[PDB]
Design a protein around this ligand. Structure first.
Ligand SMILES: [Cl-]
Ligand SMILES: [Cl-]
Ligand SMILES: [Cl-]
Ligand SMILES: [Cl-]
Ligand SMILES: [Cl-]
Ligand SMILES: [Cl-]
Ligand SMILES: [Cl-]
Lengths: 428, 104, 428, 104, 428, 428, 104
């Protein structure tokens, strides 16, 4: 009935891979059927053909080493899901099943979104290629700084920090995810002084500048009003906390961004509440695929610095899921299914958290060109710290292009550049 | 008949300050617990929001001389830029001074 | 700096109680400080007074028995948070701290919302007392049935099921949380045939009937359009999936419901993704407080049937936190802080999942009047099944009011009623 | 097959209550500190919001009989009218009981 | 019942301090009870808990010297008042009680607005710190001139006077409170020629200039239409007569000013009708607190010139209530209650009426930096008289910063400046 | 210059009669001139013809008996004032003059509004005559009850009280002026249950019923939204606090009421703050003329019970000014000027405060037909107390029409009726 | 407990008027210079705005009787119809009387 190991999934099915921990004494086959039943159909019964609405487990994969864990593969028919609705897809798949009593733990690791379902979504309002065309920036990662302190600066003092960062050679500055509108700093004052900072840095440098203005808000009306003011100020980019605001708000904003030409930077505040523990929750790569579908042009993907090679491979796995058109199944990188994105645009990976100039060669080597490297103190202040990072980046890119090995020659490349850049030198 | 003449906000209606007047202005800021800073810019008009920071703010030197040194060193390196001294009240998160000290 | 055990919290502070599991070798006092720092402040530094923007740990409570776990109490100043924004409150407190590397696991257990912050929120659009006055229903729990099968009925067949349920003596029927708008059943058709069912049941019985019409949707625009059409049909109540849709959308809908006289039933799809594991996540009681502030008139609180007396006590704890004006601190029921709601209206508790007539006496005894008892097969069908549950309910309330002890005399009360009600008898 | 029958909110699914049963229900309300009241109306359906008050609420006589007396006094004078007992909580400012005691 | 000298007020209560004059033969305790009863609650009675809605007098304070007068302290619960409504707070407190027959006279002297109520109000659209940042003006009081004659200039002749004042070095000019739209001068024409004047003065001086364009109007639609036209013209500041227009209109305008980045100058026309007699009415400090709550960025606070030291202390008292975050109880300055503003922005105090250059040292010393000094003839005309006032102010500010004593050295400071400024000299 | 005892006022002039108390040693003629100057005009001077913009004192009338008091008559040219703006008329006349230092006290006693200015106002949205035609009520005063307690009833309980009052024979019930929207009772719930109460009373009695639904609000948008929802419920009447809300908001509401057919009941909360003391303020008759111009259908005019024959004559004077088309000058009743209303509709007088059935004959005799008699406990409750008042009223009207003398035969007329009305008898 | 009963505006809370009572009211209207008129309708409720005129207004007879006659004549032709007397003030172009003089 719910466990059908002979079913072969259609190309239009949504597939889910759950890591299941059954309660002691529950056999794998019953846990697997339960997962499929509780995430689907669960006298009027014989008015309908319940066969065509059920999920089924088509495969149970034991996990060598793990204690009492296995992978259940579930298949869901296309017709269960509202077109264009990440909210309804999540509600359907993860709405119910995680509290079922015969399971001790449950983690959703991956989903195969079928092409026929993907075509019902807008996807990123812009995507990697269009974003570089609007910003005129080719052949390198983009650079951002976060402003510090997080909270407490007045709007005007905040803008001064943004100006100094930008004018040093960073492409972007960023609002903190906590900064929406607060007694110490109301949003409209911030938007206004930030726009002045961009205009001055853009005029002095001759390079397009931006700042991820946070429009995360209590209501959709208020979010859209913040977005419209950024538009009125001719800001190229804004920011949204997609998980704490929600996918309904995000999908609204993503369509609005597409309608208005605005780039959308997505911050993943709260993700570790669900995505951190190995036995329970939802893996980030699932939240990432959802975000690509609802829409964003950038997303935070975590850092790779000070991480084991296996954590690194997992991050690169989901970075490919965010950026590429076609990603082959590959369990050594946590890709459970082959994912075809059917020309839905890719999203830029944003690497941040604990990064400094000496990481630059590794960052460029690991991520390549299509990433934002988000830093956030130089001895001489904001503008010199920005120059130092910008010279370092350009040095690495030149070196790579010349055939130099960034993993082995990294410090050398940085040392050579430090010789003719005082700002970079001061940073060593 | 009043002339037409560009101004530069606080103290721009007085004789330009002497280095000694500039020093007493600075000392006041220090004695009030404010944080002085030097900033410069190529022009001045009403549409300009941000000047450019000279080095960093000085973070609790009780002597006004090194602040004055920075002005002098700015003035000599950048003889074509307007220059000014500002001061901040970190408690209130607001600027409590901003006075013009040099014009090209 | 971040650990200040002498600090006494102000009445305007937001307080958080985190269950903390530090990594091996991290002492409690550093983990506590890290919890406070990473959930708040974490040259421009000396432009601001960072003291007044930090959270601080003001108390560390070891946990007898537990291995390597303790309760860290954090205080946050009122000024950190955007007025009226659950989104910003969550972002600020839980946005970041759960991924901190020195912590092996982290669970937010409770939050003390101060009166001064509560006054910036609307709260439930109606609340318990107003809702009984609009529906005209006093001195008893309300009764609901979920329609089965979940998915697959055409709109018209779906309405037929609704009419039979309602005409039997249930107050409400309910959309499944998965049903939004799908190829087998478009929302406008469902809304229209449900309204026909309500009108016929209400005219036959002379009692006000309702059906929680699900407006969860892909965007805010489409959510509000489904709301307006329910309003246009004069429906008294709608439904929203607050967690899978998001707090930004939910707050929007809650204000629209207040503006339009509509009752709002809140379903908690996806809550076990976060709230289930004891070591990591967010306790439901926090999700419930947040929901009361953003706004809902009903919310699912889980069943009490077949659960230990300690799980029961915890449920009763958060049920009080939903319904009462003033809830005294009480660890034996999972209440970490005294909570003053400052006349914000209470939300009806919705008990559902595996309930039958013979549970009736215990449900009335446990929840009392201010609850919806949500059931969902009788041998004779929908209308008889509904009459059974309705007689059973009325029998228990009469018995209670007579001073009979519902825990000891339950079966008797039911057996007595079964004697003059064939429908109730057939259900035994 | 269920019959179609107009109903009357709380207790209308039970057989009609005896005066002794009514007095027990009233006694419960008095013991909770609620304020009982009697009201009646010519019809009952879903769209009617208010009934008419019989005299006034009795504010704290300790005995259910004086309230029953009112029920029966109303019942004898108005025997073509529906009648019900209501109870108010004055603290929470809310109605907590509303039961059909007589149908024509 | 209404006199409860043992009640201790909650932090959420609204407190009022009334100066009561009972009718001959009415004892103080009866008059105090009456005050509390007639400003609050005054068969259905026993459907409600009247205890929680009453005001009570919790203290009677005799007044040494005064004949038959005392101070009644009343406390009102939070729940009596509509959130965000100064109109409802005034109606509830002063709506009724001033006509009570057992009182010969009544004056409301002060009100303690609790933090939990304040958080329901927007407050000033901008406030002192934001306003300086938008105008770019630091380290000194701002300077305004009123235009003369009050009424009668054509719009164009009016703009000529404004241009000459502003180009002389004043920051602001001001519409008379009587000028709205009249046969000798229609508002749209005035707005237009004033905008031209500002544009010319701003371009000639390289300083931000403004003019408080009066939008006080017959209807809210008409007031908002005048505001929108100022915004269309890119005016930084407008003006409103808050008392004669009313707090409903004012609160409307204040929110619109926040939404649109407009500064709001509040004129206090009609205040002496209520606020002048010591025995009866409402003290200006109460009207000032109400204004801060409803919202304004500036407010007239009266002059300090030619006033006794005790009138001066009272003025300084309310000026602190308008500008500071926290004001300690201080009866020597007519502060009856400690007032915590919970980060609601402060309002600039405007000093005006019979001021001349020789008052400058005293004005700077009395008010400090956060004030507007509003003047309004120099022998050489508008632009020279403005230069004179501007050089005088700058001379005082330089001197003060230099540690000179402005009260003793004032005339010297002015005399020294008069030596290198012909305009200032001509003004002596 | 400002005192011209030979000037004769034009029919287009606005005239003001001020009771003036000069400071000791200020002669009458200079105080008079100061009142004219400080309430009007006070190099560019010789660009305008200041003569045609000045007010002037044209007459000084000493006051026999009074100490150091006189009546100053001021004339203002028609061109000083904005058309259709009570706000501007107040600001012009009383904006400034009450704080002048040479005056110890100042009271505005009366204003003569010229026909040519009156024609720029709408006036009452309906007026006495149209109002009776809409309500179908002829040949008698109307009857209203206020609901008690003032605050604290839930919306539904409140509606129960309204229904019982109305079904007993009153025409109207009334929201308290403090009830706007509060935690214990939100406005929308109130409006809805009150409409249910009206519909049931109106169907039982076959007489049109209303309730003054209070739309006083924080902002104009929220006031107009409350008005719109009353319109949506087809309520015939609403209420507004004109002084605490302000004349800008009131004028907006009065136009909306004309546009939408809504009757407008005006409550005078706060009037005694300004209108009570004999030496200072504004006489209520002035505020009443302003209200008539801005607009209202009803206004509270105070009671005549337990007042001296000289207070009574003053009340009657201003009652005529509210109701009649032409009122002749008459100092014995406090009418300083002949007032011609040029067909602007009259406003119903609302008599309330401490009235009972035994006052009925006097009230009918004093006010005549064009009044609302507002009461607010009968032994048998709301509906009987209502019938008692309604029979008493009809008895007095029958008696009057019969030629009986209501002042001598009152008790008799009431006793006769009490013989066949048990409700009325119980009220004696 | 007040009974539920249809009313009819001015004078419907008194005992129905005697013919001598109707005459005295009509005489009041004549003595004030008002113009009396009689009207009837088959029903009466809140929602009905106009009744039907009986013949014409009586435009200055000095005596209540001829009006009373009309009331008697109407009452006998239409015993299933409500009737009332009304009086107009032509100065203010307003109705100043409207009382019920006969019900079924
Ligand atoms: Cl991150
Ligand atoms: Cl738990
Ligand atoms: Cl559930
Ligand atoms: Cl004073
Ligand atoms: Cl002033
Ligand atoms: Cl008087
Ligand atoms: Cl009154």
């Amino acid at each position: 009935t719910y466990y059908t190991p002979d079913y072969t999934p259609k190309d239009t099915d949504i597939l889910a891979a759950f890591r299941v921990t059954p309660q002691p004494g529950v056999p794998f086959e019953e846990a697997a059927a339960a997962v499929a039943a509780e995430s689907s159909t669960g006298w009027t019964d014989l008015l309908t053909d319940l066969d065509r609405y059920k999920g089924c487990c088509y495969d149970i994969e034991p996990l060598p080493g793990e204690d009492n864990q296995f992978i259940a593969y579930i298949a869901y028919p296309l017709d269960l899901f509202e077109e264009g609705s990440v909210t309804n897809m999540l509600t359907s798949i993860v709405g119910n099943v995680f509290g079922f009593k015969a399971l001790k733990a449950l983690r959703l690791e991956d989903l195969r979104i079928p092409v026929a379902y993907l075509k019902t979504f807008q996807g990123p309002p812009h995507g990697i290629q269009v974003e570089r065309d609007k910003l005129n920036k080719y052949g390198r990662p983009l650079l951002g700084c976060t402003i510090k302190p997080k909270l407490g600066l007045s709007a005007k003092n905040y803008g001064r920090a943004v100006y100094e960062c930008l004018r040093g050679g960073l492409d972007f500055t960023k609002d903190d995810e906590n900064i929406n509108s607060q007694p110490f700093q109301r949003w409209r004052d911030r938007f206004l002084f930030v726009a002045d900072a961009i205009h001055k840095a853009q005029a002095e440098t001759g390079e397009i500048k931006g700042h991820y203005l946070n429009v995360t808000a209590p209501t959709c009306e208020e979010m859209l009003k913040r977005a419209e003011f950024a538009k009125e100020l001719e800001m190229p980019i804004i920011m949204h906390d997609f998980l704490t605001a929600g996918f309904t708000a995000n999908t609204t904003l993503s369509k609005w961004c597409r309608d208005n030409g605005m780039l959308l930077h997505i911050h993943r505040a709260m993700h570790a509440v669900m995505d951190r523990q190995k036995n329970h929750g939802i893996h980030f790569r699932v939240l990432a695929k959802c975000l690509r579908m609802s829409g964003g042009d950038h997303i935070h993907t975590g850092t790779v610095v000070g991480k084991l090679e296996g954590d690194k491979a997992v991050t690169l796995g989901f970075v490919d899921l965010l950026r590429e058109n076609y990603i082959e199944q590959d369990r050594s990188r946590g890709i459970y299914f082959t994912q075809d994105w059917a020309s839905m645009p890719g999203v830029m990976a944003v690497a941040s958290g604990g990064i400094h100039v000496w990481h630059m060669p590794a960052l460029v080597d690991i991520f390549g060109d299509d990433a934002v490297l988000q830093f956030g103190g130089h001895p001489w202040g904001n503008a010199p710290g920005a120059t130092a990072n910008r010279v370092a980046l350009e040095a690495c890119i030149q070196a790579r292009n010349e055939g130099r090995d960034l993993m082995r020659e990294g410090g050398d490349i940085i040392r050579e550049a430090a010789r003719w850049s005082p700002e970079l030198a001061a940073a060593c | 008949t009043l002339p037409k003449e560009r101004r530069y906000e606080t103290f721009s209606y007085l004789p330009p300050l002497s280095d000694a007047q500039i020093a007493r202005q600075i000392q006041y800021a220090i004695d009030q617990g404010y944080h002085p800073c030097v900033e410069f810019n190529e022009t001045s008009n009403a549409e300009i929001r941000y000047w450019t920071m000279w080095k960093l703010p000085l973070f609790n030197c009780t002597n006004a001389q090194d602040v004055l040194n920075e002005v002098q060193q700015c003035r000599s390196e950048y003889p074509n830029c307007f220059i000014r001294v500002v001061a901040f009240d970190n408690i209130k998160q607001c600027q409590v001074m901003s006075f013009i000290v040099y014009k090209p």
